[PDB]
């Protein structure tokens, strides 16, 4: 239900999960997720332009191998080569791994200390000292480097993070 | 993507052989402990996948290179290498429990099913 609409709209397509959602340049509103092997272009994960609009991409999202493990997604940048598109996007898994993807190219995997990661945010922290800040259901958390997918600190009990 | 991991293996093995042939006492161990961590990270990335029949002949390759290079630099073995081998074999089985002796019994019957990675198994 949107403000500007005020109506209960149903999603036409039949998905399992909506690992990510949000606004992108040129598109207005978007959901990642799936419907129902080592080729980058296979991907197993439908974009969907919201309001029963186009699937929009089945081309350069993460491989289907990862599709069995990934629990959460967090996009970091969206470029458009032609009608197609190119997203560089972070995932994380039930197997305590944090992965980078560039056009669905698995690059820069790290292995997390703790179990059942929930979410990730991005911390700027000056010039290029960029950290991915990972939460867990276990009420603990990681701050992992960018540049080098490498654990910097891993605190515990952490009622909340901001 | 197998190609990428394969490429990485290739690259780092060649880098290790280069350190083996060329290099000074410090620079040798520098490139070696570089390749070591390359192979660690690769291991962890592949250990992040479920099973993958086509991956195992690589993973086992990788673990073998890892252990060798590990043990070669240590100039000696450890029990982490037993656990490494433990993990590799357990992975082999979890495609298709108790301890190394019964694992190997079940493993080698699992190899008499004829998956073509015996080259690796016999190296293990």
Coordinates of N, CA and C in Angstrom, one line a residue, chain A residues 77-141:
Chain A
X77 N 25.7 -0.4 -5.7 CA 25.6 0.5 -6.9 C 25.0 -0.1 -8.1
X78 N 24.3 0.7 -8.9 CA 23.5 0.3 -10.1 C 24.0 1.1 -11.3
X79 N 24.6 0.5 -12.3 CA 25.0 1.1 -13.6 C 24.1 0.5 -14.7
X80 N 23.9 1.3 -15.7 CA 23.2 0.8 -16.9 C 24.1 1.0 -18.1
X81 N 24.7 -0.1 -18.5 CA 24.9 -0.5 -19.9 C 23.5 -0.8 -20.4
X82 N 23.3 -0.8 -21.8 CA 22.0 -0.6 -22.5 C 20.7 -0.9 -21.7
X83 N 19.6 -1.1 -22.5 CA 18.4 -1.7 -22.0 C 18.6 -2.7 -20.8
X84 N 19.7 -3.6 -20.9 CA 20.0 -4.5 -19.8 C 20.4 -3.6 -18.5
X85 N 21.0 -4.3 -17.5 CA 21.6 -3.4 -16.4 C 22.6 -4.3 -15.7
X86 N 23.4 -3.5 -14.9 CA 24.6 -4.0 -14.2 C 24.5 -3.6 -12.7
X87 N 24.3 -4.5 -11.8 CA 24.3 -4.1 -10.3 C 25.5 -4.8 -9.6
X88 N 26.2 -4.0 -8.8 CA 27.3 -4.5 -7.9 C 26.7 -4.5 -6.5
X89 N 26.6 -5.8 -5.9 CA 25.6 -6.1 -4.8 C 26.3 -7.1 -3.9
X90 N 26.1 -6.8 -2.5 CA 26.6 -7.7 -1.5 C 25.4 -8.7 -1.1
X91 N 25.8 -9.9 -0.8 CA 24.9 -10.9 -0.2 C 25.5 -11.4 1.1
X92 N 24.7 -12.2 1.9 CA 25.2 -13.1 2.9 C 24.2 -14.2 3.2
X93 N 24.8 -15.3 3.7 CA 24.3 -16.7 3.6 C 24.0 -17.3 5.0
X94 N 23.4 -18.5 5.0 CA 23.3 -19.2 6.3 C 24.6 -19.8 6.7
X95 N 25.6 -19.9 5.8 CA 26.9 -20.5 6.0 C 27.9 -19.5 6.5
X96 N 27.5 -18.4 7.0 CA 28.4 -17.3 7.6 C 29.4 -16.9 6.6
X97 N 29.0 -16.5 5.4 CA 29.8 -15.9 4.3 C 29.3 -14.5 3.9
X98 N 30.1 -13.6 3.6 CA 29.8 -12.3 3.1 C 30.5 -12.1 1.7
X99 N 29.8 -11.9 0.6 CA 30.2 -12.0 -0.8 C 30.1 -10.6 -1.5
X100 N 31.0 -10.3 -2.4 CA 30.8 -9.2 -3.4 C 30.4 -9.7 -4.7
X101 N 29.6 -9.0 -5.5 CA 29.2 -9.4 -6.9 C 29.3 -8.2 -7.9
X102 N 29.9 -8.4 -9.0 CA 30.0 -7.3 -10.1 C 29.5 -7.9 -11.4
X103 N 28.3 -7.6 -11.7 CA 27.6 -8.2 -12.9 C 27.4 -9.7 -12.7
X104 N 27.1 -10.1 -11.4 CA 27.0 -11.5 -11.0 C 28.3 -12.3 -11.1
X105 N 29.4 -11.6 -10.9 CA 30.8 -12.2 -10.8 C 31.1 -12.4 -9.3
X106 N 31.1 -13.6 -8.7 CA 31.5 -13.7 -7.3 C 32.9 -13.4 -7.1
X107 N 33.1 -12.4 -6.3 CA 34.5 -11.8 -6.0 C 34.4 -11.4 -4.5
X108 N 35.6 -11.5 -3.8 CA 35.8 -10.9 -2.5 C 34.8 -11.5 -1.5
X109 N 34.9 -12.8 -1.2 CA 34.2 -13.5 -0.1 C 35.1 -13.3 1.2
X110 N 34.4 -13.1 2.3 CA 34.9 -13.2 3.7 C 34.1 -14.3 4.5
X111 N 34.7 -14.8 5.5 CA 34.0 -15.8 6.4 C 33.7 -15.2 7.8
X112 N 32.4 -15.1 8.2 CA 32.0 -14.4 9.4 C 32.3 -15.3 10.6
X113 N 32.7 -14.7 11.8 CA 32.8 -15.4 13.1 C 31.5 -16.1 13.5
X114 N 30.4 -15.3 13.5 CA 29.2 -15.7 14.3 C 28.2 -16.3 13.3
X115 N 27.1 -16.8 13.9 CA 26.0 -17.5 13.2 C 24.7 -16.8 13.1
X116 N 23.9 -17.1 12.1 CA 22.6 -16.5 11.6 C 22.8 -15.0 11.5
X117 N 23.5 -14.5 10.5 CA 23.5 -13.0 10.2 C 22.1 -12.6 9.7
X118 N 21.7 -11.4 10.1 CA 20.4 -10.8 9.9 C 20.4 -9.8 8.7
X119 N 21.2 -8.8 8.9 CA 21.3 -7.6 8.0 C 22.7 -7.1 7.9
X120 N 23.0 -6.2 6.9 CA 24.2 -5.4 6.7 C 23.8 -4.0 6.4
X121 N 24.6 -3.0 6.9 CA 24.6 -1.6 6.5 C 26.0 -1.2 6.0
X122 N 26.1 0.0 5.5 CA 27.4 0.6 5.1 C 27.8 1.8 5.9
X123 N 29.0 1.8 6.4 CA 29.6 2.9 7.2 C 30.6 3.6 6.4
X124 N 30.6 4.9 6.2 CA 31.5 5.7 5.4 C 32.9 5.8 6.1
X125 N 32.9 6.5 7.2 CA 34.1 6.6 8.2 C 35.3 7.2 7.4
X126 N 35.1 8.4 6.7 CA 36.2 9.2 6.2 C 36.4 8.9 4.7
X127 N 37.7 9.0 4.3 CA 38.1 8.8 2.9 C 38.4 7.3 2.6
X128 N 37.5 6.5 2.1 CA 37.7 5.2 1.6 C 37.8 4.1 2.7
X129 N 37.7 4.5 4.0 CA 37.7 3.5 5.1 C 36.3 3.0 5.3
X130 N 35.8 2.3 4.2 CA 34.4 1.9 4.1 C 34.2 0.5 4.8
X131 N 33.2 0.4 5.7 CA 33.0 -0.8 6.5 C 31.6 -1.3 6.2
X132 N 31.4 -2.6 6.1 CA 30.1 -3.3 6.0 C 29.8 -3.7 7.4
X133 N 28.7 -3.2 8.0 CA 28.3 -3.4 9.4 C 27.2 -4.5 9.5
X134 N 27.6 -5.6 10.0 CA 26.7 -6.9 9.9 C 26.1 -7.1 11.3
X135 N 24.8 -7.3 11.3 CA 24.1 -7.7 12.5 C 23.8 -9.2 12.5
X136 N 23.5 -9.8 13.7 CA 23.1 -11.2 13.8 C 21.9 -11.3 14.7
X137 N 21.1 -12.4 14.6 CA 20.0 -12.8 15.5 C 20.6 -13.2 16.9
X138 N 21.8 -13.7 16.9 CA 22.6 -14.0 18.1 C 22.9 -12.8 18.9
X139 N 22.4 -11.6 18.6 CA 22.7 -10.4 19.4 C 24.2 -10.2 19.5
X140 N 24.8 -10.1 18.3 CA 26.3 -9.8 18.1 C 26.4 -9.2 16.7
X141 N 27.6 -8.8 16.3 CA 27.8 -8.0 15.1 C 29.3 -7.9 14.7

